[PDB]
Coordinates of C-alpha atoms in Angstrom, one line a residue:
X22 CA 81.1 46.3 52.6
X23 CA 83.2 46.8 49.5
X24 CA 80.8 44.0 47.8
X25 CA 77.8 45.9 48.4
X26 CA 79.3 48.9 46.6
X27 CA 79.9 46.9 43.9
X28 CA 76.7 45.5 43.6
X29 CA 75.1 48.8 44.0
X30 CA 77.4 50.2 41.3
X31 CA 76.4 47.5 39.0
X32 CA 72.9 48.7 39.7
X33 CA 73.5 52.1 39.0
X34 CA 75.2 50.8 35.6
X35 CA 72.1 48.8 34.9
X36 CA 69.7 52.2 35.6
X37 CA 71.9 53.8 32.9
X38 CA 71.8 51.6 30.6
X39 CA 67.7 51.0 31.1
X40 CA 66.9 54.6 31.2
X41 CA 68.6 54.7 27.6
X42 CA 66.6 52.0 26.2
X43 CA 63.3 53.9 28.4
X44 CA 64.3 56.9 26.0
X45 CA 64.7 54.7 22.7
X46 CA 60.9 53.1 23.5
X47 CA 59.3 56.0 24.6
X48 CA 60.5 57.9 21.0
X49 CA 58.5 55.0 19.3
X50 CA 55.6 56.4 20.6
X51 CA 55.3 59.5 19.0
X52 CA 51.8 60.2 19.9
X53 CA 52.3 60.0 23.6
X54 CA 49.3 57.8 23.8
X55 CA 51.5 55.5 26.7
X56 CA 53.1 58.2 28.0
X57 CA 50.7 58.8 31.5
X58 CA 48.8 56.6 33.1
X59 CA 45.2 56.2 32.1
X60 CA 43.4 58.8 34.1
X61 CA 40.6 57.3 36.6
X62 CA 38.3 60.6 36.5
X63 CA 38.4 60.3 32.5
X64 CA 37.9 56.2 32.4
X65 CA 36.0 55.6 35.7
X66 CA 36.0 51.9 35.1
X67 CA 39.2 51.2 34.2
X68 CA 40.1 49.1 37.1
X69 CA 37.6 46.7 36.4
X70 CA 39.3 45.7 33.1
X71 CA 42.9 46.2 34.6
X72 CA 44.2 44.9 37.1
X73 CA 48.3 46.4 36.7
X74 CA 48.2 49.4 34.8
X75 CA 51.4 50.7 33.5
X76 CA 53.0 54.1 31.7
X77 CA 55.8 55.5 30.9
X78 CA 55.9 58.1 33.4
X79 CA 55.3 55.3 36.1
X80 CA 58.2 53.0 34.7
X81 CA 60.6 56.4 34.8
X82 CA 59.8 56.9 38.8
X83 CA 60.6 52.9 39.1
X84 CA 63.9 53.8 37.4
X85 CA 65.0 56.6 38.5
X86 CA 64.7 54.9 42.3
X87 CA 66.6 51.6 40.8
X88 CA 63.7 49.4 41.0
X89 CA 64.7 47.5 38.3
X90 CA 66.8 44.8 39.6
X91 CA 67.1 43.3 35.9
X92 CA 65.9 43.7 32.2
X93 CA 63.5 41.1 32.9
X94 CA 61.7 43.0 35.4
X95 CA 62.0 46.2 32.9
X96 CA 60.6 44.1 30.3
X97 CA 57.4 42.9 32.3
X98 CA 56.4 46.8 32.9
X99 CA 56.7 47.7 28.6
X100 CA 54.7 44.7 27.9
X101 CA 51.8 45.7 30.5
X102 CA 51.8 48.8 28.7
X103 CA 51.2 47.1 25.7
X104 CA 49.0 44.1 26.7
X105 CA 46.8 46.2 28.7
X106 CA 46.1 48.3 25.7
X107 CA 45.3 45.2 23.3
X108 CA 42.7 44.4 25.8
X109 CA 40.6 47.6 26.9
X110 CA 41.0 48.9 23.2
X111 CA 39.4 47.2 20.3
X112 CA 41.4 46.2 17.1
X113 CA 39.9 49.1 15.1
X114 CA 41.4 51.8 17.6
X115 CA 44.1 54.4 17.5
X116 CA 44.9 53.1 20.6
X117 CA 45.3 49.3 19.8
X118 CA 47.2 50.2 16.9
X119 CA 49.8 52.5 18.2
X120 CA 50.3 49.6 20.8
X121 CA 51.0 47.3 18.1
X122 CA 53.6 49.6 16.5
X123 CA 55.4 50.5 19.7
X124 CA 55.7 46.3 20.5
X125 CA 57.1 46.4 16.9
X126 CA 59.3 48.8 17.1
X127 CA 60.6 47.9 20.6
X128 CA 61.4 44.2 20.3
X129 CA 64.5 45.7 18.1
X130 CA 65.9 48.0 21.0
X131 CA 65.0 45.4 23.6
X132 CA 66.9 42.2 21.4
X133 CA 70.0 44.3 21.4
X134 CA 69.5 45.7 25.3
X135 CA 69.6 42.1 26.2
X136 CA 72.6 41.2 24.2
X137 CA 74.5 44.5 26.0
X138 CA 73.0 43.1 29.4
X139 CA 74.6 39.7 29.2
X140 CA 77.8 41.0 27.4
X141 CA 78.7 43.8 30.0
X142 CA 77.3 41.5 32.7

């Protein structure tokens, strides 16, 4: 159908606009401490602390397949990167901090992201 098409073109819209804002987060992590997920044969236990790990690399193949249907669902991902962080690593940590920087730095890029969301529908 010609609604489909549309739909799926406001999707593809949608990817563009997210993969932007994926670029604008992931350069406020200079360090690329989020940038892979946490390897399993370096932190055997991982699992048993968390339960949805989350990276940057892993929110690119979500992207780049349109798996975001919305910002909300984008959003949920960045903050697992974050939250997941502020848990396994103490408060003393390279780690935990660069995770509080990045949630810094990114609620600016993700305030306006939402306003360009509604606005352009």
């Amino acid at each position: 159908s010609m609604e489909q098409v549309a739909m799926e073109l406001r999707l593809t819209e949608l990817t563009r606009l997210l993969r932007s804002v994926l670029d604008q987060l992931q350069d406020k992590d200079p360090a690329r401490i989020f940038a892979q997920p946490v390897s399993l044969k370096e932190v055997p236990d991982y699992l048993d602390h968390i339960k949805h790990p989350m990276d940057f690399a892993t929110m690119r193949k979500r992207l780049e397949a349109q798996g975001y249907k919305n910002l909300h669902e984008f959003e949920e991902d960045f903050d697992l990167i974050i939250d997941n962080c502020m848990k396994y690593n103490a408060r003393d940590t390279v780690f935990y901090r660069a995770a509080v920087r990045l949630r810094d730095q990114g609620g600016v890029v993700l305030r306006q992201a939402r306003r360009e969301v509604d606005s352009i529908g």
